Structure formats: C-alpha cells, structure tokens
Amino acid sequence: AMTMAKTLKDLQGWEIITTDEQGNITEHYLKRSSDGIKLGRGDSVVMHNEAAGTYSVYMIQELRLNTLNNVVELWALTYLRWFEVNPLAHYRQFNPDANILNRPLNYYNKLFSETANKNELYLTAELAELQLFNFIRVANVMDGSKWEVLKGNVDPERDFTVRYICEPTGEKFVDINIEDVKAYIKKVEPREAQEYLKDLTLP
Amino acid sequence: MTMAKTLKDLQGWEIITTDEQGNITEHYLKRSSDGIKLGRGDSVVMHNEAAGTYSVYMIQELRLNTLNNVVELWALTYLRWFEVNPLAHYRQFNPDANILNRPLNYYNKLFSETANKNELYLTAELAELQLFNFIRVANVMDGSKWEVLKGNVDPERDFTVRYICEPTGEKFVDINIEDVKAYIKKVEPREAQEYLKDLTLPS
Ligand SMILES: [Mn+2]
Ligand SMILES: [Mn+2]
Ligand SMILES: [Mn+2]
C-alpha cells in the first residue's frame, strides 16, 4: 500500500458539505472536522496575509468545487482595513475642510490614522482566492448601529464594523447595509453578486 | 531608527513610470539586482505554494499607491494541463463520438498522456501576485512559433497558448496570445479583463 506523506494541516480534515436549496444532502459549505467551524458564502473571515505581515478580512463569495477530484477553491470579496483607505479621498467626501480649506495633505494622513476606527472595514467587490491553511477565524462583521451598541465589548480581532463599500484603492465610498450584502451574496449566483457589488461605486 | 531587513530587500524592485512611450502614464517593475523588467502583457512563472508547484500568469495591471509606493501586481491566470477538464476538453475537440468509455479515468489518462504539458490556457480570472514569489519571465507563444521551437524548448520557461477558457478548464476559445499581449498593454485593465471574460460566455 502507498503510504502517503502528510502534514499537520491534514489533521484538520476540512469537509465539503453539499446541500439543496434549503436542506442538506446545490449549495456547498466547508466544515472543519477538528472543531466544527463551518464556512460558506456570506461568512466573513480573518485570514493571515503574509504579504501584508498581518491579517486581512474577506467575505466568502464562492466555494468552487471540482467534482472530478474534490479540489476546492475558496473565493472571497476583499475588505480593506483602515491603513488601505486613501485618507484625502475619504475626507474630501466626508470632511468639508478637505474641499473648502487648503490644508497640507499630511494633515489628513495624521488625522485619519489618529481618528479612524481601526476595526472599521471597507467592503470592496474585488475577489481574491483564499487558502484554508491561512484561515485564522470567523469574523463578526456588523453595521454602524450594532457597532455603537457593542462598542464597549468588542474583540478587536474578531469584531468589525462596515459602513461602506469602496474601490480597492480606498476611495469612492458608498453606504451599505453589510448584513444585507451577506444575505444577497448567498442568494444570487457568484458572478451576478460580484458584478452588482462592483457597479455600486462607479458612475 | 535602524530598520530590520530580509534578503528580499536586497533585490530592490524599482517602480518605473513612463508616458505612453517612456521617460520618467504606465508603470513597470525592474529588479535592481538582475535588471528583470515586468509590465502589462508580460507572462510570468510564479511559485504557487498552494499548488506545490509553479503557476503562470500574464501581468494585467501594475497598481501604484502614490501615497506610500505600495504596489499590487495583478495578472490573468493561465491554467496548466492538469487543470483542464479532461471530459470537457475531449468532448470539445475530438467529439461527435456518440460514446464515452470509462469516463473519468480514460479521459484523465488519455489527456495527460497526449496533452502538451507546456501548453497553457489563458483565463480572464485575475489574481494578485507577490514579487517574492516571482521565478522567471515566461516565454508564451502561439502554436506556429511553438512548432518551430519544438525541439529546442526550456520546459520551465517556454510555453505555447492557443486557447482561452473558463477557470474550470472548459469552454476553449481560440485566441492569439501575442495579440492578447498587445491588447492588454493597450486598453484599460478592467476593459481588457471584461472583454477576455466574455470570450467564453454565450453572446
Ligand atoms: Mn488590495
Ligand atoms: Mn507562504
Ligand atoms: Mn484556479
């Protein structure tokens, strides 16, 4: 018998659970045997981003299954973290000083990095392929109102708030109801959902 | 402040911005150490740790953040032979063959044994690449040039492309990789991507 070499990662045993329009036994979702964690469209996740030397957060948008060999591809909408926001572009849209006054740019860079909610994410329609071996934890993303309520009890590594969707460049913000984006993502087809989201920030 | 470096920092990739011709607008990346130059249209061999082997892409956009010089390298994903759907491929190029013998296995074995392992298949699916995973510039040519270079190919640098297809390795449409290359560095990134994407869709 061919004894296949394994790695610790193989102990987790991510399982592909397929279901029908509502029940079980099509729509797929991933379940980790070791702890029961389940991932599917609409779920936001904290992933290790080695290129950034820190974590990145995404909203799973598609579990692509290759029926010929069970190879799975996890695709997700990319959120931007505070340091990916274009401060000036942001203030020109929400701070009258940016358009009325002529303050030096550094003024807005310092102001943003000093006042921005570091746990406020910005949804973008830009898809990225994720690898399960980089999974950190399920993210708890909520809108501004819930955030106000939870403010005093936030787990800075799991809880985040989203009020806008914007271009990957961190500009052109559009108010959104993240909870509804989530419901919408797991309801309509992948390409249709992403395209709708992509058009929200362009004329 | 003494900044901590890694060997990667010795390569020093440089950002070069030029007009629609040259000078000091479009961007290119140049590695100071060996002079390697990368820009839209260029196909590249990258290490793919998720795949445990290399992957090939065609750079489609060099995104620059002029606020901090952080660059994002986006590229069209090529599929390698082992990512093609044997059935669909067989079924599309040889077929009008009323039958299918021992499906999966006969097709997987047949394709892998008759396919040009150095034939890539373009897809309009974008992926963000990291320079620290760059291996070498790929030499992707059309079918005619490949026959000429046939007996003198470098297995890890020389590739031939004749089709664009869906990321799932099906629905192959004839394309001229050289023409795609000229087109990519000529029109807007999104415009180019969207065009390539529709090439395999009903319309
Ligand atoms: Mn980005
Ligand atoms: Mn790695
Ligand atoms: Mn793929």
CSV table of C-alpha atoms and ligand atoms in Angstrom, one decimal:
chain,number,residue,atom,x,y,z
A,1,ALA,CA,0.0,0.0,0.0
A,2,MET,CA,1.2,3.5,-0.9
A,3,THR,CA,1.8,5.3,2.4
A,4,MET,CA,1.2,9.0,1.5
A,5,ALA,CA,3.2,11.7,3.3
A,6,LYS,CA,1.1,14.1,5.4
A,7,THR,CA,1.4,17.4,7.1
A,8,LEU,CA,-0.2,18.7,10.3
A,9,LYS,CA,-2.6,20.6,8.1
A,10,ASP,CA,-4.0,17.3,7.1
A,11,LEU,CA,-5.2,16.6,10.6
A,12,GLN,CA,-7.9,19.3,10.4
A,13,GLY,CA,-9.8,17.5,7.8
A,14,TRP,CA,-11.9,20.2,6.0
A,15,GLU,CA,-15.0,18.6,4.8
A,16,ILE,CA,-17.2,19.6,1.9
A,17,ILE,CA,-20.9,19.6,2.9
A,18,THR,CA,-23.3,19.8,0.0
A,19,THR,CA,-27.0,20.8,0.4
A,20,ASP,CA,-30.1,21.5,-1.6
A,21,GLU,CA,-31.9,24.9,-1.9
A,22,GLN,CA,-32.6,24.7,1.8
A,23,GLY,CA,-32.0,21.4,3.5
A,24,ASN,CA,-28.9,19.2,3.2
A,25,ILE,CA,-27.6,16.1,1.4
A,26,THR,CA,-26.9,22.9,-4.9
A,27,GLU,CA,-25.0,24.9,-2.3
A,28,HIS,CA,-21.7,23.9,-0.7
A,29,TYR,CA,-20.1,24.9,2.6
A,30,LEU,CA,-16.9,23.9,4.3
A,31,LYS,CA,-16.7,22.2,7.7
A,32,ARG,CA,-13.5,21.7,9.7
A,33,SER,CA,-13.7,18.3,11.4
A,34,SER,CA,-11.3,19.2,14.3
A,35,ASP,CA,-13.5,22.0,15.6
A,36,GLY,CA,-16.8,22.1,13.7
A,37,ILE,CA,-16.0,25.5,12.2
A,38,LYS,CA,-18.3,26.0,9.1
A,39,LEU,CA,-17.6,28.3,6.2
A,40,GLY,CA,-19.9,29.3,3.4
A,41,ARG,CA,-20.9,32.2,1.2
A,42,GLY,CA,-21.6,35.3,3.2
A,43,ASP,CA,-19.3,34.4,6.0
A,44,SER,CA,-16.5,36.9,6.7
A,45,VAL,CA,-13.1,35.5,7.6
A,46,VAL,CA,-9.9,36.7,9.2
A,47,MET,CA,-7.0,35.3,7.2
A,48,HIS,CA,-3.3,35.5,7.6
A,49,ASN,CA,-1.9,37.8,4.9
A,50,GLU,CA,1.8,37.2,4.8
A,51,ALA,CA,2.3,39.8,2.0
A,52,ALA,CA,0.9,42.3,4.5
A,53,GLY,CA,2.6,40.8,7.6
A,54,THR,CA,-0.7,40.9,9.3
A,55,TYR,CA,-4.3,39.7,8.8
A,56,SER,CA,-6.8,40.6,6.1
A,57,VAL,CA,-10.6,40.0,6.2
A,58,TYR,CA,-12.8,38.7,3.4
A,59,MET,CA,-16.4,37.8,2.8
A,60,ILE,CA,-16.6,34.3,1.2
A,61,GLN,CA,-18.3,34.7,-2.1
A,62,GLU,CA,-17.8,31.3,-3.7
A,63,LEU,CA,-16.9,27.8,-2.8
A,64,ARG,CA,-15.8,26.4,-6.2
A,65,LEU,CA,-15.9,22.6,-6.3
A,66,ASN,CA,-14.2,20.5,-8.9
A,67,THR,CA,-16.3,17.3,-8.9
A,68,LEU,CA,-13.6,15.4,-10.8
A,69,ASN,CA,-11.2,15.5,-7.9
A,70,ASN,CA,-12.8,17.3,-4.9
A,71,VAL,CA,-10.3,20.2,-5.4
A,72,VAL,CA,-11.9,23.3,-3.9
A,73,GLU,CA,-11.2,26.9,-4.5
A,74,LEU,CA,-12.4,29.5,-1.9
A,75,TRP,CA,-13.1,32.9,-3.4
A,76,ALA,CA,-13.9,35.9,-1.3
A,77,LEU,CA,-14.7,39.6,-1.5
A,78,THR,CA,-11.8,41.6,-0.2
A,79,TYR,CA,-12.3,44.1,2.7
A,80,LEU,CA,-9.9,47.0,3.2
A,81,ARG,CA,-8.5,47.7,6.6
A,82,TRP,CA,-8.1,51.3,7.8
A,83,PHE,CA,-4.5,51.6,6.6
A,84,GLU,CA,-5.7,50.9,3.0
A,85,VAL,CA,-8.0,53.9,2.9
A,86,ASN,CA,-7.0,56.9,0.9
A,87,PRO,CA,-7.3,59.5,3.7
A,88,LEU,CA,-7.6,62.5,1.5
A,89,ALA,CA,-10.1,60.9,-0.8
A,90,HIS,CA,-12.1,59.8,2.3
A,91,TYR,CA,-12.0,63.3,3.9
A,92,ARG,CA,-12.9,65.1,0.7
A,93,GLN,CA,-16.1,63.0,0.7
A,94,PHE,CA,-16.9,63.4,4.4
A,95,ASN,CA,-15.0,66.3,5.8
A,96,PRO,CA,-15.8,69.9,4.5
A,97,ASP,CA,-12.3,71.0,5.4
A,98,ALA,CA,-10.8,68.9,2.7
A,99,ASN,CA,-12.7,70.7,-0.1
A,100,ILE,CA,-13.1,74.2,1.5
A,101,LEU,CA,-9.7,74.7,3.2
A,102,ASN,CA,-6.3,74.2,1.7
A,103,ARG,CA,-4.6,72.2,4.5
A,104,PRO,CA,-1.4,70.2,3.7
A,105,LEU,CA,-2.1,66.6,2.9
A,106,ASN,CA,-0.1,65.3,5.9
A,107,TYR,CA,-2.8,66.9,8.0
A,108,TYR,CA,-5.4,64.4,6.7
A,109,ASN,CA,-3.0,61.5,6.9
A,110,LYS,CA,-2.3,62.1,10.6
A,111,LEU,CA,-6.0,62.9,11.3
A,112,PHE,CA,-7.2,59.7,9.7
A,113,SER,CA,-4.6,57.4,11.4
A,114,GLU,CA,-5.4,59.1,14.7
A,115,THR,CA,-9.2,59.1,14.5
A,116,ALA,CA,-10.2,56.3,12.2
A,117,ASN,CA,-11.8,53.3,13.8
A,118,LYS,CA,-9.1,50.6,13.3
A,119,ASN,CA,-11.8,48.0,13.4
A,120,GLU,CA,-13.9,49.5,10.7
A,121,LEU,CA,-13.5,47.6,7.4
A,122,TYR,CA,-14.5,48.6,3.9
A,123,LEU,CA,-16.0,46.1,1.6
A,124,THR,CA,-14.8,46.0,-2.0
A,125,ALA,CA,-16.1,43.9,-4.9
A,126,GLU,CA,-12.5,42.7,-5.6
A,127,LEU,CA,-12.3,38.9,-5.3
A,128,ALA,CA,-9.3,37.0,-4.0
A,129,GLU,CA,-8.7,33.3,-3.8
A,130,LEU,CA,-8.1,32.2,-0.2
A,131,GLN,CA,-6.3,29.1,1.1
A,132,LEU,CA,-7.7,27.3,4.1
A,133,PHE,CA,-4.2,26.9,5.5
A,134,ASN,CA,-4.2,30.6,6.1
A,135,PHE,CA,-7.6,30.7,7.9
A,136,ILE,CA,-7.4,32.4,11.3
A,137,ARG,CA,-11.1,32.8,12.4
A,138,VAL,CA,-14.6,33.7,11.5
A,139,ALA,CA,-15.0,37.4,11.6
A,140,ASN,CA,-18.0,39.1,13.2
A,141,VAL,CA,-18.9,41.9,10.8
A,142,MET,CA,-21.8,44.3,11.6
A,143,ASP,CA,-23.1,47.7,10.6
A,144,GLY,CA,-22.6,51.0,12.3
A,145,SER,CA,-25.6,50.8,14.6
A,146,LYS,CA,-24.8,47.4,16.1
A,147,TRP,CA,-21.2,48.6,16.5
A,148,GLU,CA,-22.4,51.5,18.6
A,149,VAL,CA,-24.3,49.1,20.8
A,150,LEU,CA,-21.3,46.7,21.1
A,151,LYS,CA,-18.7,49.4,21.3
A,152,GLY,CA,-17.8,48.7,24.9
A,153,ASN,CA,-17.4,45.0,24.4
A,154,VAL,CA,-15.5,44.4,21.2
A,155,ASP,CA,-13.0,41.7,20.5
A,156,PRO,CA,-10.6,43.7,18.2
A,157,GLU,CA,-9.5,40.5,16.4
A,158,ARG,CA,-12.9,39.1,15.7
A,159,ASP,CA,-15.4,42.0,15.7
A,160,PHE,CA,-15.5,44.6,13.0
A,161,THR,CA,-17.9,47.2,11.6
A,162,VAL,CA,-18.6,48.0,7.9
A,163,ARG,CA,-20.5,51.1,6.7
A,164,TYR,CA,-19.3,51.3,3.1
A,165,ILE,CA,-18.1,49.5,0.0
A,166,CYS,CA,-15.4,51.3,-1.9
A,167,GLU,CA,-12.9,50.8,-4.8
A,168,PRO,CA,-9.9,48.6,-4.0
A,169,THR,CA,-7.9,51.9,-4.0
A,170,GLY,CA,-9.7,53.0,-0.8
A,171,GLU,CA,-11.8,55.8,-2.4
A,172,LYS,CA,-15.3,56.3,-3.6
A,173,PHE,CA,-17.3,55.3,-0.5
A,174,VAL,CA,-21.0,54.2,-0.8
A,175,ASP,CA,-23.1,53.5,2.3
A,176,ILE,CA,-24.3,49.9,2.5
A,177,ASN,CA,-26.1,47.5,4.9
A,178,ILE,CA,-23.5,44.8,5.3
A,179,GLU,CA,-26.0,42.3,6.8
A,180,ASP,CA,-28.0,42.6,3.5
A,181,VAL,CA,-24.9,42.2,1.4
A,182,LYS,CA,-24.3,39.0,3.2
A,183,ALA,CA,-27.8,37.7,2.6
A,184,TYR,CA,-27.6,38.8,-1.0
A,185,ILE,CA,-24.2,37.1,-1.5
A,186,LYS,CA,-25.6,33.6,-0.5
A,187,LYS,CA,-28.8,34.1,-2.6
A,188,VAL,CA,-27.8,35.1,-6.1
A,189,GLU,CA,-25.2,33.5,-8.3
A,190,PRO,CA,-21.5,34.4,-7.7
A,191,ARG,CA,-20.7,36.4,-10.9
A,192,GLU,CA,-24.0,38.2,-10.6
A,193,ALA,CA,-23.4,39.2,-7.0
A,194,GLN,CA,-19.9,40.4,-7.6
A,195,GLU,CA,-20.9,42.4,-10.7
A,196,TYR,CA,-23.7,44.1,-8.8
A,197,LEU,CA,-21.3,45.0,-6.0
A,198,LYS,CA,-18.7,46.2,-8.5
A,199,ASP,CA,-21.1,48.6,-10.1
A,200,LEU,CA,-22.1,50.3,-6.8
A,201,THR,CA,-19.0,52.5,-6.7
A,202,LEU,CA,-18.7,53.6,-10.4
A,203,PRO,CA,-20.8,56.2,-12.3
B,1,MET,CA,15.8,54.1,13.6
B,2,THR,CA,17.7,51.1,12.3
B,3,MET,CA,15.2,49.2,10.1
B,4,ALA,CA,15.2,45.4,10.0
B,5,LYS,CA,15.7,43.9,6.6
B,6,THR,CA,15.3,40.5,4.9
B,7,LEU,CA,17.3,39.1,2.0
B,8,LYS,CA,14.3,40.0,-0.2
B,9,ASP,CA,15.1,43.7,0.5
B,10,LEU,CA,18.4,43.3,-1.3
B,11,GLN,CA,16.7,42.6,-4.7
B,12,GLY,CA,15.1,46.1,-4.6
B,13,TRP,CA,12.3,46.1,-7.1
B,14,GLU,CA,12.0,49.5,-8.7
B,15,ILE,CA,8.9,51.3,-9.9
B,16,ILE,CA,9.3,52.9,-13.3
B,17,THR,CA,6.6,55.3,-14.6
B,18,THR,CA,6.6,56.3,-18.2
B,19,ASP,CA,4.2,58.2,-20.6
B,20,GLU,CA,2.6,56.4,-23.5
B,21,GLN,CA,6.2,55.9,-24.7
B,22,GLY,CA,8.8,56.3,-21.9
B,23,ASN,CA,10.6,58.9,-19.8
B,24,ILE,CA,10.2,59.4,-16.1
B,25,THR,CA,1.3,57.1,-17.6
B,26,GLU,CA,2.3,53.5,-17.3
B,27,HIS,CA,4.4,51.6,-14.7
B,28,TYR,CA,6.9,48.7,-15.0
B,29,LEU,CA,8.8,47.0,-12.3
B,30,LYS,CA,12.6,46.5,-12.6
B,31,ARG,CA,14.7,44.4,-10.3
B,32,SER,CA,17.9,46.2,-9.5
B,33,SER,CA,19.9,43.0,-8.9
B,34,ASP,CA,19.5,41.4,-12.3
B,35,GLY,CA,17.6,44.0,-14.3
B,36,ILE,CA,14.5,41.9,-14.8
B,37,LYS,CA,11.7,44.1,-16.1
B,38,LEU,CA,8.0,43.3,-15.6
B,39,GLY,CA,5.0,45.1,-17.1
B,40,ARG,CA,1.5,44.6,-18.5
B,41,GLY,CA,1.5,41.9,-21.2
B,42,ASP,CA,4.5,40.0,-19.7
B,43,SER,CA,3.8,36.5,-18.7
B,44,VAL,CA,5.5,35.2,-15.6
B,45,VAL,CA,6.3,32.0,-13.8
B,46,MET,CA,5.4,32.2,-10.1
B,47,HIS,CA,5.8,29.8,-7.3
B,48,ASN,CA,2.4,28.6,-6.1
B,49,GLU,CA,2.7,27.1,-2.7
B,50,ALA,CA,-1.0,26.2,-2.6
B,51,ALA,CA,-0.3,24.1,-5.7
B,52,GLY,CA,3.1,22.8,-4.6
B,53,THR,CA,4.4,23.8,-8.0
B,54,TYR,CA,4.6,26.9,-10.3
B,55,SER,CA,1.7,28.7,-11.9
B,56,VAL,CA,1.9,31.0,-14.9
B,57,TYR,CA,0.2,34.4,-15.3
B,58,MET,CA,0.1,37.3,-17.7
B,59,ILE,CA,0.6,40.6,-15.9
B,60,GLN,CA,-2.5,42.7,-16.5
B,61,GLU,CA,-2.1,45.7,-14.2
B,62,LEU,CA,0.6,47.4,-12.1
B,63,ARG,CA,-1.4,49.2,-9.4
B,64,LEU,CA,0.5,52.0,-7.6
B,65,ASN,CA,-0.4,53.8,-4.4
B,66,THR,CA,1.4,57.1,-4.8
B,67,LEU,CA,0.9,57.8,-1.1
B,68,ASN,CA,3.3,55.1,0.0
B,69,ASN,CA,4.6,53.5,-3.1
B,70,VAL,CA,2.9,50.2,-2.2
B,71,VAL,CA,2.4,48.3,-5.5
B,72,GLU,CA,-0.1,45.5,-6.3
B,73,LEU,CA,0.7,43.2,-9.2
B,74,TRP,CA,-2.4,41.8,-10.9
B,75,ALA,CA,-2.4,39.2,-13.6
B,76,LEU,CA,-4.5,36.9,-15.8
B,77,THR,CA,-4.3,33.3,-14.6
B,78,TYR,CA,-3.2,30.6,-17.1
B,79,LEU,CA,-4.3,27.0,-16.5
B,80,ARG,CA,-1.7,24.3,-16.8
B,81,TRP,CA,-2.5,21.0,-18.4
B,82,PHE,CA,-3.5,19.3,-15.1
B,83,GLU,CA,-6.2,21.9,-14.6
B,84,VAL,CA,-8.1,21.2,-17.8
B,85,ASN,CA,-11.3,19.2,-17.5
B,86,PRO,CA,-10.4,16.0,-19.4
B,87,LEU,CA,-14.0,15.2,-20.3
B,88,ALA,CA,-15.0,18.7,-21.5
B,89,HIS,CA,-11.8,19.0,-23.4
B,90,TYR,CA,-12.0,15.6,-25.1
B,91,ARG,CA,-15.7,16.2,-25.6
B,92,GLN,CA,-15.0,19.6,-27.4
B,93,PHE,CA,-12.0,19.0,-29.7
B,94,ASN,CA,-12.2,15.3,-30.9
B,95,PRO,CA,-16.0,14.5,-30.4
B,96,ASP,CA,-19.2,13.9,-32.3
B,97,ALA,CA,-18.3,10.5,-30.8
B,98,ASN,CA,-21.6,9.0,-29.6
B,99,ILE,CA,-19.8,7.3,-26.7
B,100,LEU,CA,-17.7,7.7,-23.6
B,101,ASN,CA,-15.7,4.7,-22.2
B,102,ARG,CA,-14.7,4.5,-18.5
B,103,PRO,CA,-15.3,8.3,-18.1
B,104,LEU,CA,-13.0,10.0,-15.6
B,105,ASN,CA,-10.1,7.5,-15.8
B,106,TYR,CA,-9.9,7.0,-19.5
B,107,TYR,CA,-10.0,10.8,-20.0
B,108,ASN,CA,-7.6,11.7,-17.2
B,109,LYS,CA,-5.1,9.1,-18.5
B,110,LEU,CA,-5.6,9.9,-22.2
B,111,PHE,CA,-5.3,13.7,-21.8
B,112,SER,CA,-2.3,13.6,-19.5
B,113,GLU,CA,-0.6,11.2,-22.0
B,114,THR,CA,-1.4,13.2,-25.2
B,115,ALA,CA,-1.6,16.8,-23.9
B,116,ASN,CA,1.3,19.2,-24.4
B,117,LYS,CA,2.3,19.8,-20.8
B,118,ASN,CA,3.8,23.1,-21.9
B,119,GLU,CA,0.6,24.3,-23.4
B,120,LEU,CA,-1.1,26.8,-21.1
B,121,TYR,CA,-4.7,28.0,-21.3
B,122,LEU,CA,-5.4,31.7,-20.7
B,123,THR,CA,-8.3,32.6,-18.4
B,124,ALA,CA,-9.7,36.1,-17.7
B,125,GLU,CA,-9.5,35.4,-14.0
B,126,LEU,CA,-7.3,37.9,-12.2
B,127,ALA,CA,-5.0,37.1,-9.3
B,128,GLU,CA,-2.8,39.3,-7.2
B,129,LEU,CA,0.8,38.2,-7.3
B,130,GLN,CA,3.7,38.8,-4.9
B,131,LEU,CA,7.1,39.6,-6.2
B,132,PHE,CA,8.7,37.4,-3.5
B,133,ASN,CA,7.2,34.5,-5.4
B,134,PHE,CA,8.4,35.5,-8.9
B,135,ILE,CA,10.5,32.8,-10.5
B,136,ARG,CA,11.2,33.9,-14.1
B,137,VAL,CA,9.7,35.6,-17.1
B,138,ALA,CA,7.7,33.1,-19.2
B,139,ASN,CA,8.0,32.9,-22.9
B,140,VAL,CA,4.5,32.3,-24.2
B,141,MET,CA,4.0,31.9,-27.9
B,142,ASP,CA,1.3,30.8,-30.4
B,143,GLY,CA,1.1,27.4,-32.0
B,144,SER,CA,3.2,28.3,-35.1
B,145,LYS,CA,6.2,29.6,-33.2
B,146,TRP,CA,6.0,26.6,-30.9
B,147,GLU,CA,6.3,24.0,-33.7
B,148,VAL,CA,9.4,25.9,-34.9
B,149,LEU,CA,10.9,26.0,-31.5
B,150,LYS,CA,9.6,22.4,-30.8
B,151,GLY,CA,12.9,20.6,-30.4
B,152,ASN,CA,14.6,23.4,-28.5
B,153,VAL,CA,12.3,24.3,-25.6
B,154,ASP,CA,13.2,25.1,-22.0
B,155,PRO,CA,10.5,23.1,-20.1
B,156,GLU,CA,10.1,25.8,-17.4
B,157,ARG,CA,10.3,29.0,-19.4
B,158,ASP,CA,8.8,28.2,-22.8
B,159,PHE,CA,5.1,27.7,-23.3
B,160,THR,CA,2.5,27.8,-26.0
B,161,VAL,CA,-1.0,29.0,-25.9
B,162,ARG,CA,-3.8,28.6,-28.4
B,163,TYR,CA,-7.0,28.9,-26.2
B,164,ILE,CA,-8.6,31.0,-23.5
B,165,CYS,CA,-11.1,29.1,-21.4
B,166,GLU,CA,-13.0,29.2,-18.1
B,167,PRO,CA,-11.1,28.8,-14.9
B,168,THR,CA,-12.8,25.4,-14.6
B,169,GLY,CA,-10.8,24.2,-17.6
B,170,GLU,CA,-13.6,24.0,-20.1
B,171,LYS,CA,-15.1,26.0,-23.0
B,172,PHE,CA,-12.0,26.6,-25.1
B,173,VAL,CA,-11.9,29.6,-27.5
B,174,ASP,CA,-9.2,30.2,-30.0
B,175,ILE,CA,-7.0,33.3,-29.2
B,176,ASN,CA,-3.7,34.6,-30.3
B,177,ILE,CA,-1.6,35.1,-27.1
B,178,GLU,CA,0.6,37.6,-28.9
B,179,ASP,CA,-2.4,39.7,-29.9
B,180,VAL,CA,-3.8,39.4,-26.4
B,181,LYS,CA,-0.5,40.7,-25.1
B,182,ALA,CA,-0.6,43.8,-27.3
B,183,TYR,CA,-4.3,44.3,-26.4
B,184,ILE,CA,-3.6,44.1,-22.6
B,185,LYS,CA,-0.9,46.8,-22.7
B,186,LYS,CA,-3.1,48.9,-24.9
B,187,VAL,CA,-6.5,49.2,-23.4
B,188,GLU,CA,-7.7,49.9,-19.8
B,189,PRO,CA,-7.3,46.9,-17.4
B,190,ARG,CA,-10.9,46.5,-16.5
B,191,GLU,CA,-11.9,46.9,-20.1
B,192,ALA,CA,-9.4,44.3,-21.2
B,193,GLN,CA,-10.4,41.8,-18.4
B,194,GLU,CA,-14.1,42.1,-19.1
B,195,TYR,CA,-13.5,41.6,-22.8
B,196,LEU,CA,-11.5,38.4,-22.3
B,197,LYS,CA,-14.1,37.2,-19.8
B,198,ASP,CA,-16.9,37.4,-22.3
B,199,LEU,CA,-14.9,35.5,-24.9
B,200,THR,CA,-16.1,32.3,-23.3
B,201,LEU,CA,-19.7,33.3,-22.5
B,202,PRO,CA,-22.8,33.0,-24.6
B,203,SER,CA,-23.4,36.0,-26.8
C,1,MN,MN,-5.6,45.5,-2.2
C,2,MN,MN,3.7,31.4,2.2
C,3,MN,MN,-7.9,28.2,-10.4
